């Protein structure tokens, strides 16, 4: 079973990025 649809990306500010990443720690990308 499969599905697909499109979603427009919203603009993210610098302070938005900082707000998120200030709480976050690195995670594995490629395992």
């Amino acid at each position: 079973s499969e599905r697909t649809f499109e979603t427009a990306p919203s603009e993210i500010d610098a302070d938005e990025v900082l707000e998120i990443l200030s709480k976050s720690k690195p995670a594995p990308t490629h395992l």
């Binding site: 697909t4 603009e11 993210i12 976050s24 990308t29 395992l31």
Partner: protein, 126 residues
Amino acid sequence: LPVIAAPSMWTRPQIKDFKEKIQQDADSVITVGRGEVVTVRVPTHEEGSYLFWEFATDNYDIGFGVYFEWTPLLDEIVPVYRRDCHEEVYAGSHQYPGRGVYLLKFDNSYSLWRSKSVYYRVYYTR
């Protein structure tokens, strides 16, 4: 030949605040079914430089990965693997390699009996 930038990925435990902020829109929630795989197409913004994404689930893990579609030519950005995004919020980023379409794969093909509720946001930076 065009080189692809490595992506970055993070995790944060503030998962309740995330969902609660997401649920305030319907177009930000997905219900991946049993054995189903949902692909979210995210076109590169004409005035953008990076992709940024967030996602999380309820109660169960899910397969996540990212591909880049050229414009059917594909580049593997984030290999598909199961993430414990029911315990934490997974965020990530990737520099636009060009004009095209990112393919965010929410893979629940391995689950026989459990549907996965998916909260997510996709962005771009100027």
